[PDB]
Tab-separated table of C-alpha atoms and ligand atoms in Angstrom:
chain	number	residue	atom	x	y	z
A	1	UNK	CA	50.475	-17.600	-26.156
A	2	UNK	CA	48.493	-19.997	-28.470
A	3	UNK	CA	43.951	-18.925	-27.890
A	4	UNK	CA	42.333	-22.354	-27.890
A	5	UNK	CA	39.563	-22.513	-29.562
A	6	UNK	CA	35.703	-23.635	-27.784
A	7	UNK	CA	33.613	-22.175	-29.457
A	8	UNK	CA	30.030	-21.870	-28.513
A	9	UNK	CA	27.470	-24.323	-30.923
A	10	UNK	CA	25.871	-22.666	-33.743
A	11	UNK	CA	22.758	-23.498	-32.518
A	12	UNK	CA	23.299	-21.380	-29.704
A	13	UNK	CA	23.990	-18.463	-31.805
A	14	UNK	CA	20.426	-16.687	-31.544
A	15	UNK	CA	21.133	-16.481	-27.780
A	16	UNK	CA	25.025	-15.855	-27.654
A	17	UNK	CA	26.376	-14.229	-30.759
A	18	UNK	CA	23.337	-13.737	-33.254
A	19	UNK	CA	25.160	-10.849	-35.438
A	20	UNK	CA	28.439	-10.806	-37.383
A	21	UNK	CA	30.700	-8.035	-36.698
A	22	UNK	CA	33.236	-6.112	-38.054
A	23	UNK	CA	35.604	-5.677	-35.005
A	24	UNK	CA	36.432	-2.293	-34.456
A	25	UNK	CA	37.072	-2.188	-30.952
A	26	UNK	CA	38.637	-4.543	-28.302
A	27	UNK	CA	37.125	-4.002	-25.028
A	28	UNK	CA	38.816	-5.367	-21.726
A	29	UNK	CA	36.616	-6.727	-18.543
A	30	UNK	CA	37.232	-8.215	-15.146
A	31	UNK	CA	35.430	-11.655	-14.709
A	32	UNK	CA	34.883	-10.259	-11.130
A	33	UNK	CA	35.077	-13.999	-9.665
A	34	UNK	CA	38.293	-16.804	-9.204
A	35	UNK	CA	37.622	-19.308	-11.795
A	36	UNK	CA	39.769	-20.834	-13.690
A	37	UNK	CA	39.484	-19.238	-18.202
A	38	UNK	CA	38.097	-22.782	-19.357
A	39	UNK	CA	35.455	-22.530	-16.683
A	40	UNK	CA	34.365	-18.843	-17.433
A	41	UNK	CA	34.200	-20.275	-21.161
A	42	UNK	CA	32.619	-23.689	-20.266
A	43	UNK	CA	29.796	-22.186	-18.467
A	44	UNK	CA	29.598	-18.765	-20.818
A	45	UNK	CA	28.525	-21.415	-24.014
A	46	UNK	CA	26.741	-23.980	-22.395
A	47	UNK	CA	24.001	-21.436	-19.691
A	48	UNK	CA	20.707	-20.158	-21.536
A	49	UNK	CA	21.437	-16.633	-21.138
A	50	UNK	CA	21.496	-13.899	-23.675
A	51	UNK	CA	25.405	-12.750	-22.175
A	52	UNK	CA	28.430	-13.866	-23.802
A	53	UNK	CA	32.216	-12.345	-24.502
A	54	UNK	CA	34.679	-13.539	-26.843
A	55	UNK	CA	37.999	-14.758	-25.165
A	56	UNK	CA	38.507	-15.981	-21.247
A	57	UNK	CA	42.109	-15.604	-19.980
A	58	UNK	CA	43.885	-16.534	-17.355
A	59	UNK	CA	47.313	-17.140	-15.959
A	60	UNK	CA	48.225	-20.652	-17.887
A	61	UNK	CA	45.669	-20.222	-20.840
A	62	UNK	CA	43.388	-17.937	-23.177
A	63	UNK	CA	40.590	-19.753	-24.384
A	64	UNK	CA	38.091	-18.322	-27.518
A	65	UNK	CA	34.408	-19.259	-26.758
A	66	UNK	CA	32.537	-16.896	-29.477
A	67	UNK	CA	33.738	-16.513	-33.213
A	68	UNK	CA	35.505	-12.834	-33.375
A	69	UNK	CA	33.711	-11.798	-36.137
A	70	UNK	CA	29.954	-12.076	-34.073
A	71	UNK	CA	28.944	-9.871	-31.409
A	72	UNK	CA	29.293	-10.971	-27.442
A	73	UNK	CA	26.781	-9.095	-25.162
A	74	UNK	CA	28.769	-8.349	-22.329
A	75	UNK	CA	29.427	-4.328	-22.748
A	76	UNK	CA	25.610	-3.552	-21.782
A	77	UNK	CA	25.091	-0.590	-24.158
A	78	UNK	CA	22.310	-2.598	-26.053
A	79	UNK	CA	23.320	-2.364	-29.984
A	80	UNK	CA	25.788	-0.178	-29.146
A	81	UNK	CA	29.009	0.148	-30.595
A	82	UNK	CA	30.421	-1.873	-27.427
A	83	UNK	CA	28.076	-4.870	-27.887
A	84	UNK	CA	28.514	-4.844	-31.641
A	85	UNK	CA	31.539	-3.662	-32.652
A	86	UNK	CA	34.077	-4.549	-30.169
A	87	UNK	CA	35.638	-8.061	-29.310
A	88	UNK	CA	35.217	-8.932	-25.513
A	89	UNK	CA	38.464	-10.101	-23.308
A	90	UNK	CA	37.615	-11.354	-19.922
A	91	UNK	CA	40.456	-11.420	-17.591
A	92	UNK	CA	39.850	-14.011	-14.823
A	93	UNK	CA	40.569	-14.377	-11.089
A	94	UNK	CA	39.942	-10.510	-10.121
A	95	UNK	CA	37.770	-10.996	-7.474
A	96	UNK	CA	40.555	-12.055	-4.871
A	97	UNK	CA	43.368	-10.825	-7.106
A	98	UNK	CA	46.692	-12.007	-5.772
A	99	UNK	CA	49.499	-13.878	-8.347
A	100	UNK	CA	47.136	-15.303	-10.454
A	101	UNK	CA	45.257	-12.393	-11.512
A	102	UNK	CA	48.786	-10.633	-12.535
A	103	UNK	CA	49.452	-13.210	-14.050
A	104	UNK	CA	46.748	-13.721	-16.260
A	105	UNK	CA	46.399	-9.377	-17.068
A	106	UNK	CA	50.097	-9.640	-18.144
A	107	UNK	CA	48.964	-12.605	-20.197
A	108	UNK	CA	45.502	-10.619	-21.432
A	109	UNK	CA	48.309	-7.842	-23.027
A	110	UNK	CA	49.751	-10.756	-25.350
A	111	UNK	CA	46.048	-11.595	-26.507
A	112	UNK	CA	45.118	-7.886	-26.820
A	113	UNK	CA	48.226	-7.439	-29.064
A	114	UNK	CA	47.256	-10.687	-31.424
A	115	UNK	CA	43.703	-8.964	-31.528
A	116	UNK	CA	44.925	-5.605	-32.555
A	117	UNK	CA	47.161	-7.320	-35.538
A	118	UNK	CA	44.820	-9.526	-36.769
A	119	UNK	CA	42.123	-6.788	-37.055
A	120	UNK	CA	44.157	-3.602	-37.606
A	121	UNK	CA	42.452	-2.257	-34.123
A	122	UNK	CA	44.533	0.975	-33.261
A	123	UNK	CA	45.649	1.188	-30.025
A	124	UNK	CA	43.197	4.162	-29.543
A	125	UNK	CA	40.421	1.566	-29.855
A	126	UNK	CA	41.491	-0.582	-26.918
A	127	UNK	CA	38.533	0.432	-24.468
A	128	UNK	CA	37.471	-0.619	-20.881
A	129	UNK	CA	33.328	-1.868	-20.650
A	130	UNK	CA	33.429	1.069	-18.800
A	131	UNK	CA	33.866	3.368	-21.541
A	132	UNK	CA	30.705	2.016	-22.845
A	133	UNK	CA	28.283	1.656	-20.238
A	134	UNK	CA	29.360	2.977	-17.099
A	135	UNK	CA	29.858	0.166	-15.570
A	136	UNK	CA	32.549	-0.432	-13.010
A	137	UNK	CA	34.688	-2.573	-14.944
A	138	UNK	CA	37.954	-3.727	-15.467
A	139	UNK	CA	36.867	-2.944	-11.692
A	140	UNK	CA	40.469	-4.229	-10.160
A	141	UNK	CA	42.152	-1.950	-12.604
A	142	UNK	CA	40.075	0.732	-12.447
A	143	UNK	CA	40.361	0.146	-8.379
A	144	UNK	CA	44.217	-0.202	-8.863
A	145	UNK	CA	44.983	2.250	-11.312
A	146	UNK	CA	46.564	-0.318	-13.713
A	147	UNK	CA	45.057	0.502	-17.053
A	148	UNK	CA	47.267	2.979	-17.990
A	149	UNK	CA	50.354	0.743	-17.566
A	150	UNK	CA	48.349	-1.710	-19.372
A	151	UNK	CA	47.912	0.141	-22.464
A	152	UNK	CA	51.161	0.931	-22.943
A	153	UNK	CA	52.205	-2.931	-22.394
A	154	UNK	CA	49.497	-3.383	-25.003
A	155	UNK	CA	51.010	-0.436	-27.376
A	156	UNK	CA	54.801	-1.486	-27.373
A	157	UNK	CA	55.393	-3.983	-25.193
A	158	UNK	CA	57.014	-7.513	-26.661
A	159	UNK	CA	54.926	-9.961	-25.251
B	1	UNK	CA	20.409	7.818	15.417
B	2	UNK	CA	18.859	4.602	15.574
B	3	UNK	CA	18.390	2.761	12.416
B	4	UNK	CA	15.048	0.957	13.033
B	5	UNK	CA	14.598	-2.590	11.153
B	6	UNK	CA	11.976	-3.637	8.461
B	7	UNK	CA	13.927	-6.597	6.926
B	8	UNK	CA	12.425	-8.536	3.742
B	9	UNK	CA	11.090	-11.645	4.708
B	10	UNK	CA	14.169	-14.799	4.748
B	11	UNK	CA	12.162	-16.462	1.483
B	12	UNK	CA	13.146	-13.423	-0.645
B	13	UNK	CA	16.784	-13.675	-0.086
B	14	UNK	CA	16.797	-15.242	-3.834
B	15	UNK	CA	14.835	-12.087	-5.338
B	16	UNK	CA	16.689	-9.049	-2.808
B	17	UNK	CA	19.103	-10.301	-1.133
B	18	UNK	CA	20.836	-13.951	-2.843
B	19	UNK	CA	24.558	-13.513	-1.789
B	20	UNK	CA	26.134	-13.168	1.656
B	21	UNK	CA	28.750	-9.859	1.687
B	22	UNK	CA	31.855	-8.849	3.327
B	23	UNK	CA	30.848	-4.830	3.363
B	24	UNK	CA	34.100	-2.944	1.891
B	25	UNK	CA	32.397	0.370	0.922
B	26	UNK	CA	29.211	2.419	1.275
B	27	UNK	CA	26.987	3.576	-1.771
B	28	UNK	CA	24.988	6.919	-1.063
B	29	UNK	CA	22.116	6.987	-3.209
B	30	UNK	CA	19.137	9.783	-4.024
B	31	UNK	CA	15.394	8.339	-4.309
B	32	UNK	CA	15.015	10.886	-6.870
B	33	UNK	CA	11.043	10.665	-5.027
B	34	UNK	CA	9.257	12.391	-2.428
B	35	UNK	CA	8.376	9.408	-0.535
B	36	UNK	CA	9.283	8.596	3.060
B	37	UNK	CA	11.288	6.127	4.238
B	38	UNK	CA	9.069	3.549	5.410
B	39	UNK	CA	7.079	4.207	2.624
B	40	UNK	CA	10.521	3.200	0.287
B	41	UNK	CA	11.277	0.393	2.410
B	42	UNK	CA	8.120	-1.518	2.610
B	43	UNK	CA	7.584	-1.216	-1.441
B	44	UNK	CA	11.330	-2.311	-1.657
B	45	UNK	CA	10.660	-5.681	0.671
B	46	UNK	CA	7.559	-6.630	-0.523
B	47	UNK	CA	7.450	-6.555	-4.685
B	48	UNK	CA	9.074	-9.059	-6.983
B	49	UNK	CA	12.107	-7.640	-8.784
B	50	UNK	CA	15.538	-7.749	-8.191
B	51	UNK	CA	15.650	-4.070	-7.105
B	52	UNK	CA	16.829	-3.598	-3.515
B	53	UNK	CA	18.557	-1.003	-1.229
B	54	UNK	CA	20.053	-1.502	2.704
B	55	UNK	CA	18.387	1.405	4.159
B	56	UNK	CA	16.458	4.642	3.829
B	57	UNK	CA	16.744	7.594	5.025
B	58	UNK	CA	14.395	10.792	5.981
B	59	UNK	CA	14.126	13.176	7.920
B	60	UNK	CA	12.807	11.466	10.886
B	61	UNK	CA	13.993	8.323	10.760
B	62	UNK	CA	16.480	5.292	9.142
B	63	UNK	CA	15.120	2.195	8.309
B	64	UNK	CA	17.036	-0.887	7.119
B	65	UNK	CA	15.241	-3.261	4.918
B	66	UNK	CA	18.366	-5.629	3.549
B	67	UNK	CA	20.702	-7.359	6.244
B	68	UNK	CA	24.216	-5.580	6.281
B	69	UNK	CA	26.335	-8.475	5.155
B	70	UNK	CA	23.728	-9.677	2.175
B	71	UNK	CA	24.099	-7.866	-1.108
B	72	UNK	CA	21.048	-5.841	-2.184
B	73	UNK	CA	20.598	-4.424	-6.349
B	74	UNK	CA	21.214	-1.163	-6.124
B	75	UNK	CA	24.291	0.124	-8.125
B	76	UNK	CA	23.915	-0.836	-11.192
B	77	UNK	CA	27.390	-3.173	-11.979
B	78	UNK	CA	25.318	-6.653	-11.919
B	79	UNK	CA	28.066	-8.752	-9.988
B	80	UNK	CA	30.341	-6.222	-9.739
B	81	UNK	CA	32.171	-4.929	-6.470
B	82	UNK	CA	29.182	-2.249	-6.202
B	83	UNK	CA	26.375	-4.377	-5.659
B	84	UNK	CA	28.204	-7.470	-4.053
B	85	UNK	CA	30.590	-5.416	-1.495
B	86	UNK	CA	28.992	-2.042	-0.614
B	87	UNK	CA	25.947	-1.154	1.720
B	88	UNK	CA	23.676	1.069	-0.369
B	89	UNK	CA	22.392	3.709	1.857
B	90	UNK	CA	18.945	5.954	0.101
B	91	UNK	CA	18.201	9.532	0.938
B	92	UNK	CA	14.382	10.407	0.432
B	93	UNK	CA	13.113	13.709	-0.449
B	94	UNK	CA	15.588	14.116	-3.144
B	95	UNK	CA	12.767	15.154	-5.784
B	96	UNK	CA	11.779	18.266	-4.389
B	97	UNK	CA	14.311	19.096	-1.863
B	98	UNK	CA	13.691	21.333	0.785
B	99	UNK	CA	14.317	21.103	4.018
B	100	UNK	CA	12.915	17.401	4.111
B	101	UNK	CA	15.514	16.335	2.231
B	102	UNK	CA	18.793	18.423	3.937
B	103	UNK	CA	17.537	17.194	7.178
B	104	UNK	CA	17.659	13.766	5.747
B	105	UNK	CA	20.972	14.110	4.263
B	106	UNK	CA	22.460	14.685	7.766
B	107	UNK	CA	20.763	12.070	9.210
B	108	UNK	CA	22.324	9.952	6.467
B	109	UNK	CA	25.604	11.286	7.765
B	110	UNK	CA	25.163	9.526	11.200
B	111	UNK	CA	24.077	6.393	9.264
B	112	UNK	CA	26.936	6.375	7.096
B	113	UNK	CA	29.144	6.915	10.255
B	114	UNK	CA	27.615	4.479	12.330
B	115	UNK	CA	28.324	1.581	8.867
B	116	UNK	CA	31.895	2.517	9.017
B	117	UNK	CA	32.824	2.069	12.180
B	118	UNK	CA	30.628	-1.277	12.503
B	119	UNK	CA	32.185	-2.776	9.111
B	120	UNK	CA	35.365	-0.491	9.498
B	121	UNK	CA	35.209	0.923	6.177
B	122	UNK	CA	37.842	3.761	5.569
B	123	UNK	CA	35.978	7.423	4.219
B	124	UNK	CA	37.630	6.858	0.802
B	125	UNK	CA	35.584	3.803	0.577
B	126	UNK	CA	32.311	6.079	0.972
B	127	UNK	CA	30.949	6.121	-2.793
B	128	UNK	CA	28.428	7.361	-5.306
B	129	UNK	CA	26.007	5.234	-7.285
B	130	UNK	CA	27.451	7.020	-10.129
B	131	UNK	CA	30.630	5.637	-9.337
B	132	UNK	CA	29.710	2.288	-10.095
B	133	UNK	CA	27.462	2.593	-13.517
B	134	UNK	CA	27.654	5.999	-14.475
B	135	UNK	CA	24.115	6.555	-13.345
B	136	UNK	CA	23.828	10.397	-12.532
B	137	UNK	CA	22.673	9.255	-8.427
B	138	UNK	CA	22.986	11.084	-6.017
B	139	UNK	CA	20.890	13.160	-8.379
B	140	UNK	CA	20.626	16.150	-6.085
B	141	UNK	CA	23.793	15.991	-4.325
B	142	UNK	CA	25.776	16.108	-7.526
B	143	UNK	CA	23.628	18.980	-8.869
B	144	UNK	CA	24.433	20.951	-6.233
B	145	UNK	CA	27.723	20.114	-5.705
B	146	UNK	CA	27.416	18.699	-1.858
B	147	UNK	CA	29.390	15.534	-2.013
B	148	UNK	CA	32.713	17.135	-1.184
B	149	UNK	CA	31.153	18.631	1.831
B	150	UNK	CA	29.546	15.054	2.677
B	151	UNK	CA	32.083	13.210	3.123
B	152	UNK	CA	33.576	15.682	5.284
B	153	UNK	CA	30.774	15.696	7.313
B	154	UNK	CA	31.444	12.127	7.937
B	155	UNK	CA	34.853	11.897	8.334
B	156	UNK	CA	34.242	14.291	11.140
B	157	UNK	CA	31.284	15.596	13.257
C	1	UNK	CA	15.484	26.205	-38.346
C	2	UNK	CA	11.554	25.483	-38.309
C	3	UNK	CA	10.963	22.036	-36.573
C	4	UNK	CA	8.408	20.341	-38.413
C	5	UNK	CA	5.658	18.213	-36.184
C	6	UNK	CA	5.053	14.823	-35.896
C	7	UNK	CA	4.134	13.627	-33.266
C	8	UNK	CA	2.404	10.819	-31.962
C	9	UNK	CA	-1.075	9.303	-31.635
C	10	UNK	CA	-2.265	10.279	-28.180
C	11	UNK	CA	-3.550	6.375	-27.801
C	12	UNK	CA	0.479	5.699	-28.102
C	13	UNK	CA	1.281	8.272	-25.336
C	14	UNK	CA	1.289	5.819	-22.556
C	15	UNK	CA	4.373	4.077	-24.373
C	16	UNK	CA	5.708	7.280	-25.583
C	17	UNK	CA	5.250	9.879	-23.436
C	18	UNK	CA	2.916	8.588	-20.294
C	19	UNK	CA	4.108	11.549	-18.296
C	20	UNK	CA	4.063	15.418	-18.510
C	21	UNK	CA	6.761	17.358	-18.138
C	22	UNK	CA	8.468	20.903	-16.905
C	23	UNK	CA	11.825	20.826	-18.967
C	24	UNK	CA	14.875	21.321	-17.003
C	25	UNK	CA	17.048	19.921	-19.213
C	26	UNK	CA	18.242	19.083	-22.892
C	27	UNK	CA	19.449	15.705	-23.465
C	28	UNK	CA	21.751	15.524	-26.839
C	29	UNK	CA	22.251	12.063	-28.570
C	30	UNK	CA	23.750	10.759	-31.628
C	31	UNK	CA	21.133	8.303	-33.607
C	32	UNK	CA	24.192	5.609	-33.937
C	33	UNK	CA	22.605	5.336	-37.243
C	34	UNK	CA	22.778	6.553	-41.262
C	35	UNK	CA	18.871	7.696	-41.700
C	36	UNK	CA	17.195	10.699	-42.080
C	37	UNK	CA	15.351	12.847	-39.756
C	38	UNK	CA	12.216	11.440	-41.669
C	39	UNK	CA	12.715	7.952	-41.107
C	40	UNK	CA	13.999	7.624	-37.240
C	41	UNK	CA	10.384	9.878	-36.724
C	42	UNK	CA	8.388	8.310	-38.248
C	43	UNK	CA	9.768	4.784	-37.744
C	44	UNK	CA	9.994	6.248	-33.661
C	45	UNK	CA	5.937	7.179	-33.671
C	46	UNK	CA	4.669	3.854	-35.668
C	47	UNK	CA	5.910	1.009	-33.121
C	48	UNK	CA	4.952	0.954	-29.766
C	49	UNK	CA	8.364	0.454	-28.035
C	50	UNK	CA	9.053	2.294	-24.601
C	51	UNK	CA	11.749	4.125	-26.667
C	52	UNK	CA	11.548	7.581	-27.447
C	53	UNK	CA	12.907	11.241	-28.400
C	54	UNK	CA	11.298	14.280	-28.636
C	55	UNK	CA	13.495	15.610	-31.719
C	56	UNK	CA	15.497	14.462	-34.572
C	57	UNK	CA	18.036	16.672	-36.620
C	58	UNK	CA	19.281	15.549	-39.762
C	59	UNK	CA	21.538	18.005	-42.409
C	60	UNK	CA	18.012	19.123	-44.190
C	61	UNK	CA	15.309	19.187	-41.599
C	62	UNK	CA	14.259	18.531	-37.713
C	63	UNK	CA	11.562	16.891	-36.908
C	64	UNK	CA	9.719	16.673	-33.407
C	65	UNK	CA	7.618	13.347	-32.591
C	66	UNK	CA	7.101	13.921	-28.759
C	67	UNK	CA	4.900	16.960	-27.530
C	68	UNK	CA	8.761	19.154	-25.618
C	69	UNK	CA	5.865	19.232	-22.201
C	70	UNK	CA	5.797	15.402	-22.325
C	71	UNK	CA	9.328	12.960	-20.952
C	72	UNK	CA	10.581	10.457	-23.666
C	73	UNK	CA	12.595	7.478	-22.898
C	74	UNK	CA	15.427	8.013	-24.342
C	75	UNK	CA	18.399	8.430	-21.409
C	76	UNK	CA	18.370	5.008	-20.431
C	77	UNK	CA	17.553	6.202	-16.225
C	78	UNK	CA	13.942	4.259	-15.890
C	79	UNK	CA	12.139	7.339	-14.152
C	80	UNK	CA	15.352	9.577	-13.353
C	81	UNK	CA	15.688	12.850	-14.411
C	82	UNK	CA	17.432	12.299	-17.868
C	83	UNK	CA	14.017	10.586	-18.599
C	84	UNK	CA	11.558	12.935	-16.935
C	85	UNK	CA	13.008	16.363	-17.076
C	86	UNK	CA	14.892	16.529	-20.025
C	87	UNK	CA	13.802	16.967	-23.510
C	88	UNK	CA	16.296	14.623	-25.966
C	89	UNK	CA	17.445	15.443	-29.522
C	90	UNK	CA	18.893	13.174	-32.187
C	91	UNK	CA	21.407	13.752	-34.295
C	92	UNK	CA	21.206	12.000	-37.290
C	93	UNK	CA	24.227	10.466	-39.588
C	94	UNK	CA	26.657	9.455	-36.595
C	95	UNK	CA	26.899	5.956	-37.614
C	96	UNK	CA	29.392	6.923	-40.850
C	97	UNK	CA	29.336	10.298	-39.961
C	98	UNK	CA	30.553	12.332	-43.308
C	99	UNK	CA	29.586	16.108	-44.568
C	100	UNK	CA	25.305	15.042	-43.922
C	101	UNK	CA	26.293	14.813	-40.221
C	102	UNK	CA	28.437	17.550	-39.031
C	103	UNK	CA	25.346	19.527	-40.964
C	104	UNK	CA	22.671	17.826	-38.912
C	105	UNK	CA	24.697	18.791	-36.166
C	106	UNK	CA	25.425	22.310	-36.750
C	107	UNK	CA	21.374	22.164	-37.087
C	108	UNK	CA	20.969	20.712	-33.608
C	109	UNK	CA	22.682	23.485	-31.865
C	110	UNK	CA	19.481	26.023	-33.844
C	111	UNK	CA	17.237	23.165	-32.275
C	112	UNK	CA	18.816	23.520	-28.693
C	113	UNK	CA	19.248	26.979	-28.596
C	114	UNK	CA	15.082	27.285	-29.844
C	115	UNK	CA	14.331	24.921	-26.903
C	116	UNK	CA	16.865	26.862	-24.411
C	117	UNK	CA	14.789	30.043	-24.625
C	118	UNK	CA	11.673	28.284	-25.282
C	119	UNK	CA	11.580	26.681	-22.219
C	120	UNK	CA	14.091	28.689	-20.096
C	121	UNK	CA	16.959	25.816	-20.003
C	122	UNK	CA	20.484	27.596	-18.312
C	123	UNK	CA	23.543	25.932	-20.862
C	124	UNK	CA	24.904	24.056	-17.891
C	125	UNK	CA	21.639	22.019	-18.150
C	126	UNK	CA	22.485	21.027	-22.000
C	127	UNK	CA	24.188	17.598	-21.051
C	128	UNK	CA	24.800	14.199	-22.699
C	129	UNK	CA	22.879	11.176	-22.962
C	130	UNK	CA	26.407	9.621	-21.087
C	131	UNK	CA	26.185	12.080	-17.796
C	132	UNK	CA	22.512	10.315	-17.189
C	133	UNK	CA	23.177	6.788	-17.704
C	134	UNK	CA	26.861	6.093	-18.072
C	135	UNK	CA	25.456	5.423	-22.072
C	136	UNK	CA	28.680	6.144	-24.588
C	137	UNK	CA	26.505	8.606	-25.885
C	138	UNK	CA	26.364	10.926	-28.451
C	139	UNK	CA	29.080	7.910	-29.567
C	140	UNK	CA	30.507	10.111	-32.482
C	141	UNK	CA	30.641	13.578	-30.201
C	142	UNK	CA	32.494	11.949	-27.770
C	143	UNK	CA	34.406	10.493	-29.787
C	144	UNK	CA	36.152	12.647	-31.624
C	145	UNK	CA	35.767	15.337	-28.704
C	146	UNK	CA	33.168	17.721	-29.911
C	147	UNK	CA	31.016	17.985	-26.859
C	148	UNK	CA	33.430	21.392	-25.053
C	149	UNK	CA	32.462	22.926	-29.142
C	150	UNK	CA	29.116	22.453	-29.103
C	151	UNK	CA	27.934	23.961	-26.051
C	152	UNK	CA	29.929	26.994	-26.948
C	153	UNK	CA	28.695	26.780	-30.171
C	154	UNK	CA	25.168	26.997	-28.312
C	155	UNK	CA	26.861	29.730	-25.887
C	156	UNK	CA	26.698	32.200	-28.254
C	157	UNK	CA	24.947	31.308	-32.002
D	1	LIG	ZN1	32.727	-5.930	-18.175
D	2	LIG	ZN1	21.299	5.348	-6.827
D	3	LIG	ZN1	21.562	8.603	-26.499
């Protein structure tokens, strides 16, 4: 599936994405709410606050809002190798779940493969924020027990 | 036991307390202090940051300083199924341990008891602060190894 | 290996190291970073952030730049007891890693075993900056699985 691109305004950049990166790492998150990928994104580059990620998707679309070669905080481990070496997908509608949200993790593998190719990420360096920080999240996978079946979708599936 | 009340005032909802919650687990916490109860509560209630807990518990007595279905910041996760869905429950006396703090583990027991049966929440939904961030809390209980024999406390009597 | 001293202005100890300290623990860490023992030191004691470490072990030297009976912020748990009971060393190098770091570590097991019989710390109390705070660290260990190695590297010498 094509990523459209809105990207956050340079100007912005001090607050959103102020170093480049050399993407190393892809790390997967749960938005933990039920809006829609172009909202997540919309309101990610346009709020004052020093938290970003890279790509919002959902079950129609996956929308880019931060250039993948600059860093997104949204692993919380400071200037740590999450924060500033790994590119940020949010997967959206996790906080009810239900179709939508299985829809749009399914979709999340596709954009997770494209990632991999384009930056010769190994499928060793697919991480959850978790791995980085502690924090609870992909939470609905974690909770479900689904990110095991989703890194093999994301190793050798044909999506 | 009874679980006496020492809410934060309503105009700090924004600071302690800003969303409503549907409780779906319980988050046992150490203080990590020596410090009881009320004394943990009425700090909690009263200063500015967005640092908050549900209730405390001693030796002597529980006191709840966050409504049960408002969200307090204590696990760690930001907006994240720990803070916005679980009750965070604090066990004082952590820091030196002793009987002070054994006794108040049991009590927190009864407390954790009495939130599952009021919110139904199942005994697999009973959690760790670590859980949710990684934090190493409930400091002592995981040092010593007394969660597994917590839970079945509470799942029984 | 000696460990060479330091350390800190006492007008900078209440940014530092505001707080004495009985170690209980050892806290080790990977510096994320490609300088020397020298630099992370000395850059550590000349600003006056409320970051910290009390050692840091490169592939030639260690060098100590927090007093081991004072905490250093360094485990990311505010006043917890990564933070206030254990003493934290840095190994140098991780960010590229290469021959200069697997030296600097093989020196940090000398520097923990020192501070394990200086200070009476059991080997189940050597842990990682990750079991305080959920923090991916030491990044490189952990990466490439050399935490089970070390401590029985530090087992026996
Ligand atoms: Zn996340
Ligand atoms: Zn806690
Ligand atoms: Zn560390």
């Amino acid at each position: 599936m094509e990523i459209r691109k809105k990207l956050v305004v340079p100007s912005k950049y001090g607050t959103k994405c102020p170093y480049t990166m050399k993407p190393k790492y892809i790390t997967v998150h749960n938005t933990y709410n039920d809006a829609p990928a172009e909202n997540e994104v919309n309101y990610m580059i346009t709020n004052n606050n020093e938290v970003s990620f890279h790509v919002a998707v959902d079950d129609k679309q996956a929308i880019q809002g931060i250039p993948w070669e600059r860093n997104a905080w949204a692993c919380g481990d400071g200037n740590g190798p999450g924060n500033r070496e790994s590119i940020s997908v949010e997967i959206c509608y996790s906080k009810s779940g239900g179709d939508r949200y299985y829809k749009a993790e399914n979709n999340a593998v596709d954009v997770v493969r494209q990632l991999m190719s384009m930056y010769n990420i190994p499928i060793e360096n697919v991480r959850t924020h978790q791995s980085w920080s502690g924090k609870y999240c992909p939470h609905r996978m974690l909770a479900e027990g689904r990110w095991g079946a989703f890194i093999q979708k994301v190793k050798s599936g044909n999506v």
